[PDB]
Every structure is written in C-alpha cells, then in structure tokens.
Amino acid sequence: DIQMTQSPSSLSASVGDRVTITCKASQDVNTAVAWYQQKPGKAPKLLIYWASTRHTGVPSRFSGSGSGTDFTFTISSLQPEDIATYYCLQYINYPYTFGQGTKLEIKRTVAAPSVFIFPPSDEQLKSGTASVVCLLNNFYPREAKVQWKVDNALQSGNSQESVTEQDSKDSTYSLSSTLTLSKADYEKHKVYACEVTHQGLSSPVTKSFNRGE
C-alpha cells in the first residue's frame, strides 16, 4: 500500500506569502499525483492532476511539480480565501491513497474580540434547563480564555465552546461558550457573567446580566 506523507501537517503564513507543501510517495508513482483543496464546510476540490496539470478554472497562483517520489504544491501569493486543508493523492495503483492533509492558516494582526452575553429564554426555562451563551466575535489569534461566574462562583465542568474556522476575508475567528444549568439552579442566582481574556484586550472584559431584570 503506497504511503503518501505530507510536510508539514499544519502551516501558518502571512497574506501575500509564497507557501510550499511537499508530499513524499513511498514508491515510484511517476506523475500520477493529484492535489486537492478543502475549504471549511465544503467538498474537496481538485486543483492539480498529473502532478502539474492545473484543473480548469483553478487560479494560476496554484501550481504543482515533481515526479517519481517527490511532489510539491505551491501557492505563489497567499490570499485570505486560501484558508483550507490541502491533500495530495496517489493514483498510480489501487488502492488510491491520500496524504494526511496540511492545514493552512493565516497570520494577521491582533484583533480584539467583541463580547456579548445572552440570557436563557423564557421558552427554554419551561423545559427545566437554562443555557447561558457568551459570544466572542472576530478576534485573532485563536487563543482565548472564557470564564463563567454565577454570583461570584467560577463555573467549571458545565460549559462547552465551539470556534469557527478562520474567516475567508478578515482571517478572524469567532467563539461561542454555552453554560448549561438546571432551571432551579438558575432561578436561585442573580448575577451571570462571562469574563474574556485575550491578547488584544488591555485587561479582561466582562459582560454580565442580572436574572430578574
């Protein structure tokens, strides 16, 4: 079974940079190599086949080269919409085999999140559960800390976060944290707050609300 191993697994580069990814085939595979791009939420798209032929309607900044066992995928000038994972594929013999993919991320200047807190709805309170949500909107870099407090008590173990992929235009991330409580527990307290720590904020920022108001 022909192994395709890509270098590197992850890569962070600046807009306008030349970016380079290599793929090593564990056997001679001549020019029977294809390169794919898979943007967040989309199906893979063929960029290059026969190692260096550009598929139709593919931007000129994408190119490939190589032969035998060593293959190169190149972006000449990295654009914001090029955020994706890239895969190489061997198609000389069955079974066709993919490289493990290279995740491409974009470096940009620091951007501070905008923060919003949302109380649970009356509707959800009917069902005996309460979800409090804190949104962190449009920030870079990805590292961010979100602490929940209910009447001064740090909440731990009762929240989950989800973070978007990098935006294809401004290259920022967004992040939601949802704090789930029983309705009884929720009714027993007044002050609900989420506190956000992040490189682009001079000191942590707290958004909060009082239940009975």
Binding site: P95, F98, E123, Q124, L135, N137, S162, T178
Partner: protein, 210 residues
C-alpha cells in the same frame, strides 16, 4: 455546469444496510470513472472505491476496509452511480462523496449508531439594550446535521454558524449568530431558518429584543 448530487444518506443501525446515489449531469457520463471517498468528522479523506466505464467491463476496485461489504455500481442511462453498503459498522460513520475524478459532489452523512433520532428545539439569543449581536440556539438533536440560514438566505454578512458540539447527553447542539446595525433592531425583522432533515423538523424563529 457539471453537477453531482448525492442522496440516500442518514441514520442506520449497526449491522444494517444503506444505498447511496450520485446523480450526475453536465458531462458525458458513460466515459467517466466514478469514485467514492469518505471523511469522518475532523479526519482526512479516505478513498472508498472506483467503477470504470463499460468499455472496461465496468471493472470495480475497493479500499481494503470495505471490500466484501460495499458494492459500487452504475446506470449510464440514468447518469447515476451507486454505493450499496452492507454490514455497517460504527467506524463507517462519515460524509461520503461521489466523484467523476474531476468534480466532487456536496457529500452525504451516514451515521451508524443505535441512538434514536431526535428533533431540536430552537431558542432565541436576543440582542441587548453601533453593532448589535443576536442568534439562535439549536439544542438537543441527533444525528447531525442541521442547517441554519437567516431571512431565508437574504442575510449572510456577519453570520457565524458554529460547529455543533456533542453534549454529555449524547445529543448535539449549535448556535448561529449575526451582528447587525443597532439602529435596525426595532425595524428590520430577523428570522433564523432551521432544518433538521433526519427528524423532519423545520422551524422559522423570529429573534428580537425582549
């Protein structure tokens, strides 16, 4: 102009069977070699198999992990390819893609689980009291996926639909938010369009200041 439309995906018991279809248009179908590829969530692409043209005796080849369980077929008159999947295992859970080697379809999720189908509840994330943020919380559903749009698709800039998170209950949940002008809050209507096809659930939720 070239189109590959997958269908047949959904929730299925361990051990069960399922048959996927790929409806092709925009190309001379009989000349192409149709391929299936799958991708588990957060993982890489994995080739499933390929069927060749009639002139090649419709020869078929398979990945080792599926051979003897999966059967690929075609119907040139229909311009459709098929993936019949037997003896399903939980490890087969993935989004399955159909390809003519040059273009790929949107893919269809196959979930191999003994868990029950459940429809979600849609809760508002109401904006406070100049940018405002609001959203919809889509809570407690199974299996994936749900789709969310805003104002039937007419509102897209500033929309962030988050990746679903699997909760402790074994049920999924996801939020969709949008940031809008504060001045449009008591004037412009905001409705999130939620579809949970596996449970036949469709909801339109107006979100507004409380």
């Amino acid at each position: 102009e070239v189109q590959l439309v997958e269908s047949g995906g959904g929730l299925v018991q361990p051990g069960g069977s399922l048959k996927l279809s790929c409806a092709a248009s925009g190309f001379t179908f009989s000349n192409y070699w149709m391929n299936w590829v799958r991708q588990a969530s957060g993982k890489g692409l994995e080739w499933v198999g390929e069927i060749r043209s009639k002139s090649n005796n419709y020869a078929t080849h398979y990945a080792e992990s599926v051979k003897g369980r999966f059967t690929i077929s075609r119907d040139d008159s229909k311009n459709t390819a098929y993936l019949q999947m037997n003896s399903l295992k939980t490890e087969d859970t993935a989004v399955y893609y159909c390809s003519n080697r040059y273009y790929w379809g949107q893919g269809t999720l196959v979930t191999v689980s003994s868990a029950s189908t459940k429809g979600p509840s849609v809760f508002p994330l109401a904006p406070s009291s100049g940018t405002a943020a609001l959203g919809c919380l889509v809570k407690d559903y199974f299996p994936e996926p749900v789709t969310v749009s805003w104002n039937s698709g007419a509102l897209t800039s500033g929309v962030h639909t988050f990746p679903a998170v699997l909760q402790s209950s074994g049920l999924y949940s996801l939020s969709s938010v949008v940031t809008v002008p504060s001045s449009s809050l008591g004037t412009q209507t905001y409705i999130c369009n939620v579809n949970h096809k596996p449970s036949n659930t469709k909801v339109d939720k107006k979100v507004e200041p409380k």
